[PDB]
């Protein structure tokens, strides 16, 4: 009823059923938008109404993109994406370009609509069911399912890749100096051209897609005060790596030396070349914290030496595309946040500092979700995969507001941790 192209069979992980996740409350503003965008997809036949007979479910909500003003439907298919991780990852996965990280500017286009044009495995459809709630539980939730590749499902880009690689053949041939990567509902396009000349080429790419049926959100560019649309492109080169740094002083109290060894002990797990014996000697008997201990000559020989190792590449740390990705965020105060991305205990791949934003305007929750997105983006670009998050916040709290500030087509996998200030292993 949509496309005569043959349907590709998708089966969930052996011994695992479909998603049966409940639907969280939604604000009237989102229900109103969600009911509208759903009605239209029903008419066009992308979506079909279903009832209780379908034991499966997934959560939905909508985000009003400040990108294009226009709402976007989001379906939290994280559960479903795990249940079918054999199909898209190992089976038929999208290669990653090591060169995207290496581009002065990279823009990202929302190529979701592209999916509403390939029929979804008739059998697999039952799993994509979702429910729309109603204010004050006025009417039973209205349920639907997909008949075509759904947006936000790891399988869609995998299946649509065949036609996607054909839609890009021309553009990539007339611009072999532009890198293009597809990650779910996104197209990361990066170039070394001048900014204004990049804006053009992207705008040209939108055309080439439009000449193929693929439409991409019309991003607004306001002419007033905060010219936010200048941030649309990412700059992978401008991305820095926040290293570990030991304080500098002349008068070191007992207290100071303790903390300086604590941190150095922590860091000994990352860099095996950190010694603390020579420095801890200064602390021998039960001394009073407030006591300026003179730093020995051969003692301050390690303090200024260890720091000469805290600015080097970690010990043969390489990325393995076969292992998951983890990321930790620690609230460093005054609006600053630090993060680390690794696959193994202490051998991390990137350590950075997500500096503040005036649009956050002192709101811890808003800044953390922005940090999560920002970090995810970097991940997808650099390695091509979303990291799992160890979020410094309480479940109850994050699940009450994260949606109000979410602005991405994808949703990362996260868990909550209540780890107190382990140590200022990351001196900001």
């Amino acid at each position, epitope marked *: 009823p949509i496309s005569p192209i043959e349907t590709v069979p998708v089966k969930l992980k052996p011994g695992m059923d479909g998603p049966k996740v409940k639907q969280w409350p939604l604000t009237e503003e989102k229900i109103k938008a969600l009911v509208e965008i759903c009605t239209e997809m029903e008419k066009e036949g992308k979506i079909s109404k279903i009832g209780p007979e379908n034991p499966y479910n997934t959560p939905v909500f909508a985000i009003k993109k400040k990108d294009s003003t226009k709402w976007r439907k989001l379906v939290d298919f994280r559960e479903l994406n795990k249940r079918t991780q054999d199909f898209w990852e190992v089976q038929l996965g999208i290669p990653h370009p090591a060169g995207l990280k290496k581009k002065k500017s990279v823009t990202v286009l929302d190529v979701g609509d592209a999916y509403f044009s390939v029929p979804l495995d008739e059998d697999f459809r039952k799993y994509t069911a979702f429910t729309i709630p109603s204010i004050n539980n006025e009417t039973p939730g209205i349920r639907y399912q997909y008949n075509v590749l759904p947006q936000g499902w790891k399988g869609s880009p995998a299946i649509f890749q065949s036609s996607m690689t054909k839609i890009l053949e021309p553009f990539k041939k007339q611009n072999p100096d532009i890198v293009i990567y597809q990650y779910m509902d996104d197209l990361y396009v990066g170039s070394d051209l001048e*900014i*204004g000349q990049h804006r053009t080429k992207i705008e040209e790419l939108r055309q080439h897609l439009l000449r193929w049926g693929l439409t991409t959100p019309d991003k607004k560019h306001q002419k007033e*005060p*905060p010219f936010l649309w*200048m941030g649309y492109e990412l700059h992978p080169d401008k991305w820095t790596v926040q290293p570990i740094v030991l304080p500098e002083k002349d008068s070191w109290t007992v207290n100071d030396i303790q903390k300086l060894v604590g941190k150095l002990n922590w860091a000994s797990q990352i860099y095996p070349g950190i010694k603390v014996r020579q420095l801890s000697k200064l602390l021998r008997g039960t001394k009073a914290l407030t006591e300026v201990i003179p730093l020995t000559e051969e003692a301050e020989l390690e303090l200024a030496e260890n720091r000469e190792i805290l600015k080097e590449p970690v010990h043969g740390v390489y990325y393995d595309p076969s292992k998951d990705l983890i990321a930790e965020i620690q609230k460093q105060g005054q609006g600053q946040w630090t993060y680390q991305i690794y696959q193994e205990p202490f051998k991390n791949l990137k350590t950075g500092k997500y500096a503040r934003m005036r649009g956050a305007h002192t709101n811890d929750v808003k800044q953390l979700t922005e940090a999560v997105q920002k970090i995810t983006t970097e991940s997808i670009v650099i390695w091509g995969k979303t990291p799992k998050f160890k979020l410094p916040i309480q479940k109850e709290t994050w699940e009450t507001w994260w949606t109000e500030y979410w602005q991405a087509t994808w949703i990362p996998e996260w868990e909550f941790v209540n780890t107190p200030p382990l140590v200022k292993l990351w001196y900001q």
Partner: antibody, heavy 123, light 108 residues
Framework: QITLKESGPGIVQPSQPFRLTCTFS??????????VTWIRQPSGKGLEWLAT???????RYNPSLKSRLTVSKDTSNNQAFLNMMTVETADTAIYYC???????????????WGQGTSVTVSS | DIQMTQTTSSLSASLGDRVTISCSAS??????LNWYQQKPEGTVKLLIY???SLHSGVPSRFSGSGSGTDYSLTISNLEPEDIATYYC?????????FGGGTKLEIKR
């Protein structure tokens, strides 16, 4: 290397319309941040903002004269236009056209200007 | 409609002096003000943009400051050219508005 020259009729009958031309070089009215602004300056008074036409055609007009203003552009030959309808003696002034441009998230100023064309209104 | 006013209308001074021009906004403009210089002939040049950023080519003896509603231009040591009329323009909201202009003279 950015140059801008206004073209005009200099002398315009009352109630009739006039068309100013800003011929420029050095930039394109197609690049992301550019736009062309029209400024007026009555003889003796200070600067008055008329309108700014941008690359994406998202133009902005002075609320007091939006009813008599119309800003066009010929992106091909690098020309910006300003039409004013039913002019009065009060529109006798020097009209400048400058290259407005949005550099970053906060930088937005009229980087270069023209020398202006004098348009006087009288029978 | 943001009213930009430069109280000081005509200001006289001497070569080498330090002068400061004040630009008062009708409402908070969040540091979205630009400064313009208009020589006696008429040509108009952009000195400062975004409260205090010098436009390439303008001498270092030019500096802007201000915040919220009050903004000021400061020419460290007057030179012969400097003696001119100065304009402040706000762009935190269309319509764009200009100050009233401050003519800088030569004390005699």
């Amino acid at each position: 290397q950015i140059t801008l020259k206004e073209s005009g009729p200099g002398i315009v009958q009352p109630s009739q319309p006039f068309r100013l031309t800003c011929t420029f070089s050095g930039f394109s009215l197609s690049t992301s941040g550019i736009g062309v602004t029209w400024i007026r300056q009555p003889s003796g008074k200070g600067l008055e903002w008329l309108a700014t036409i941008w690359w994406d055609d998202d133009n902005r007009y002075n609320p007091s004269l939006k009813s008599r203003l119309t800003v066009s552009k010929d992106t091909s030959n690098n020309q910006a236009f300003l039409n004013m309808m039913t002019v009065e003696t009060a529109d006798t002034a020097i009209y400048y056209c400058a290259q407005s441009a949005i550099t970053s998230v906060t930088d937005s100023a009229m980087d270069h200007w023209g020398q202006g064309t004098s348009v006087t209104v009288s029978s | 409609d943001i009213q930009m006013t430069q109280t000081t209308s005509s200001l006289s001074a001497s070569l080498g002096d330090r002068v400061t021009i004040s630009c008062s906004a009708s409402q908070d403009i969040s540091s979205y003000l630009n400064w313009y210089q208009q020589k006696p002939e008429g040509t108009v040049k952009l000195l400062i943009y975004y409260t205090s950023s010098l436009h390439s080519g303008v001498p270092s003896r030019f500096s802007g400051s201000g915040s919220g509603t009050d903004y000021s231009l400061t020419i460290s040591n007057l030179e012969p050219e400097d003696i001119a009329t100065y304009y402040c323009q706000q762009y935190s909201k269309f319509p764009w508005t200009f100050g009233g202009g401050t003519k800088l003279e030569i004390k005699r």
